[PDB]
Design a protein around this ligand. Sequence first.
Ligand code: HEM
Ligand code: HEM
Lengths: 48, 444, 216, 64, 285, 57
Amino acid sequence: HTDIKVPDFSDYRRPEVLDSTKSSKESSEARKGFSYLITATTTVGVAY
Amino acid sequence: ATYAQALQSVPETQVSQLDNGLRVASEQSSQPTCTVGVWIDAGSRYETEKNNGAGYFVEHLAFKGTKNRPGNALEKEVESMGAHLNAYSTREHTAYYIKALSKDLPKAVELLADIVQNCSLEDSQIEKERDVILQELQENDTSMRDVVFNYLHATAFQGTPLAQSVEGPSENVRKLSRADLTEYLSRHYKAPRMVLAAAGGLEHRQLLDLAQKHFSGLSGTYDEDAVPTLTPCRFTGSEIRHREDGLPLAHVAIAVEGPGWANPDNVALQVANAIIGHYDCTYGGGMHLSSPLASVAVTNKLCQSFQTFNICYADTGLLGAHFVCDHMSIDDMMFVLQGQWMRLCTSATESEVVRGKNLLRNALVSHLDGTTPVCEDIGRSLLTYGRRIPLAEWESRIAEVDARVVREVCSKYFYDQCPAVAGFGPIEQLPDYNRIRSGMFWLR
Amino acid sequence: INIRKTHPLMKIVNNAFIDLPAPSNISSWWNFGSLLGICLILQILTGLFLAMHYTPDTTTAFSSVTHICRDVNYGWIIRYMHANGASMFFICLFMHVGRGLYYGSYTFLETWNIGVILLFATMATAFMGYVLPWGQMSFWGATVITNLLSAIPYIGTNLVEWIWGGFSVDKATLTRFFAFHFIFPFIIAALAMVHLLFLHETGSNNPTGIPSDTDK
Amino acid sequence: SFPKYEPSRLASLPTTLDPAEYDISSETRKAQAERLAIRSRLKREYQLQYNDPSRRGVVEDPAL
Amino acid sequence: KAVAFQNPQAHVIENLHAAAYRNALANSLYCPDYRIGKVTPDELHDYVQNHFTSARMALIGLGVSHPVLKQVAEQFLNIRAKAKYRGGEIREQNGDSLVHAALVAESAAIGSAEANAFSVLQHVLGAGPHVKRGSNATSSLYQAVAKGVHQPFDVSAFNASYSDSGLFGFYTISQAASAGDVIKAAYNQVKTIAQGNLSNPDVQAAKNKLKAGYLMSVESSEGFLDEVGCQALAAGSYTPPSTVLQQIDAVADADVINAAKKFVSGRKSMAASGNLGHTPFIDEL
Amino acid sequence: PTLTARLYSLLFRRTSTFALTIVVGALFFERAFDQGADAIYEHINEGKLWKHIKHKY
Ligand code: HEM
Ligand code: HEM
């Protein structure tokens, strides 16, 4: 059962997270903020 | 009385440096029983794909005969003087240690040196131990908690070699050659990285002299400077769900980022996991436990068990929770566990932090008793931290942590993070990933 | 544990609109149920503001509709939104009917019967509301369709005299149709809840018609 | 102290901060040995057919 | 009860104790199968008022001082048989592809040099594997059956010492259709050991084995607590462990072959469990 | 990109802070966008409305 490996998502990953060697702590706030900023602009339009 | 003054009545571990580069360290404590061990930084993280599971195989063939005392004479001397041989290996550490008596110390160190630096492999040995590891994998496919931890590391460290298993996949096990074994032995059983440490009733001079008379002559130079070097990897956050309904109970492991080692957030998150902690279904006082997760889970009959816990590796790790529960109970147990995490994130009071301090101190002192766990304390201390940390230091770091810093740290490392869910069993009711993430950040 | 599965209103709502196990491969055409619902409640709202500005009599009807479309501000978009909302209602409705015919979702029997009752109800509502403006096309469409109801022998003539409220198309016919164009969409909303009830009981339907109870 | 030098299609990645150069496995030693061997043999053939005192024409590279 | 008994060895040891004595030591630690939901608290009140008296109690303190302990003892705690051997067997046909067979005679009570002879004897015979993934170069029973049967098996001796009686024997885990070979091979080994074929450096090796085990039960404060309390109730008098080891290794193989001669002389009792299609009863031995 | 990261750290961490953020954003963009929309509508005619010839009389 130890032979469970993931198929690699290199086609799907974001350009900050295509590096499978750099850490993903200092890459977190910008990515989450960009997604939430799209949600915020949507919410602004709906509230208008 | 005077608990801090009683903590100053604890001996100190002598640290010395054998001329090959070897870290030796001793804690002369007050007992006739000794534990002498070797901690080696050769886990599974330092491997290729084709060297996967070579280290587990080495540890099998670590005790099965050498070029010096061939075949079984090692075991015969162990059972001659009544030695207690033991070994384990993790993804980041590998240790061999011996529980024995105050007087067989030169002969025990001779045994341990002949284990490490003169390990030799043979064809009957490699064939029979390949069959043995096929038996061990085929009979530990059903060790369920082990399968859950395998899935969790595999899904949280995708691509990087940290996702390798401790045993390796079957098709790297059934085709290893002696040459790759010799390469692994050559490239990771090196003098400066490893620690000889003893704990018991014995003086440091004796240990230093015996290490001088035996460990003078292992290693110190690499095969044309092919230096293994750490890579601080990346925590993905995902879910792998193994739907297999013909099982009685369902296992969930949920995990987030590890803080690392040297940061004090290590200690503060260990306080948070002292608050959350562990329940097993066989307790008394079930309706009245102070841990709120277990109180709600018992009164509403949610889970068989949980352990809510920490794991750290070099600049990384898995901070998380494990719970086992019935296939019609996973969702509400999940909900109450995220409720406990977020209640600690935004609304951490003072008395619960005091309870965390009591639990963590008692667990730390109760963990550091008995000669062999104290020797394991010293081994993992001088490997990772590079020093035996004293326990007055732990007292200082506990007393320098209050409710404010705890809710700061849990607001940093938990609140709206990207989790990893490794679920195994009957988990069709186990909620989809988006509602886990929507349950993380909470508007109320 | 959780208020979302203890409070009894939210028990029904959590087992209806939150934790509803739909299948995973819904295509574009299953949005039209929600679209029919949203068109319906927007119809109810725009009609409510229309009912606040309208005087229903054959002397006064066209005067009042003109009054709404001029003087009461934004009532021009309220009127036009009600009319074209009925139009989009029937476009979405024929799409939803065509989907239910096409993907083999018509096996769900009593759901489908409730559907046909809903279809007649929407047709009656649209007919009576289209009588309401009391113009030329309104008037002659009304007279044509009522004598079409009179085509059935021996009771249908008197039935048509009965639904007139007169011997022709009179003021009484106008207020009868005002009252029923008001009161039928509430019946439509309640029967929509019944439609959704039987659908939640029996189970939804994937595009491929495969029994899709493994990938919710 | 530094945002770790994102590369481009123009900015070459320099020799120092690879950071693949510090994970020397035995395969990289094997590859560097064989690559030096290939360069050795090609400079040998080239130098012998470069220093012939009778060789009038050009050395006529098959690579170009 | 279910959580504890999911290991097979709890059922095996309990069916051996229900096979061991004809009397109250055959009662389990655990509640029996049917009493769950039948017993009242009045037995509990009576049981505390006749067994939790001040005359029956050992209070041990570690980390405390003496007079604090003594004073709180003096303020609160001033508030106030002969099991027979049985003979026989219990077969537990269950079917887990694991024959579990424990074979036990009656040996000796606690606190005798005879009991020390039985202890050094069972370390001669077989015990817990001192090498992880080991091969047991010294456990002679494992030697004799590894000579005999080339399969997954495991053989270990067994001592249940009590204040009045005691149990000696061994314990075997094997496959279903190969268990008879294992039990016969191990028993013929015990015969040729109890004949007197047991040598002096093996005696010294087992002396060091028992000395190692006894010093290594009392490493931390928990095993230290265990030893001191069970002594201070069982005897009422502390003894240092060093002179305990002195009293241990004062014996020789005289009492060892006398006691093994008693065991082969002893009327056997046993308990088997599992898929038992090829299991020796008693009579095949 | 850190300008979006520091925007996350300032205005997207908390809930009520996020709500007050979209309040201020919707109000200011409402004002300026209605001004721009009316400007585009007058620009696309510039000679047809009632306002300019009503004040030039
Ligand atoms: C109960 C809620 C409703 C009320 C109170 C209501 C009220 C009205 C009123 C007062 C009118 C006359 C206004 C006018 O025709 O200019 C009207 C017209 C009309 N209504 Fe409704 N209505 C309602 C629901 C609906 C629904 C559900 C439909 C069908 C989708 C509908 C279809 C129509 C149509 C087709 C007209 C004629 C539009 C026109 O000729 O201008 N109404 N309604
Ligand atoms: C009053 C107008 C109607 C409304 C508001 C309405 C509303 C809905 C809604 C909300 C759904 C669920 C949509 C989904 O699950 O994707 C639905 C499903 C369905 N409706 Fe209706 N419906 C109406 C009329 C009808 C009619 C006339 C029929 C035909 C008899 C019909 C047949 C169905 C069927 C077969 C489904 C199941 C869809 C599937 O799982 O494939 N409905 N309806």
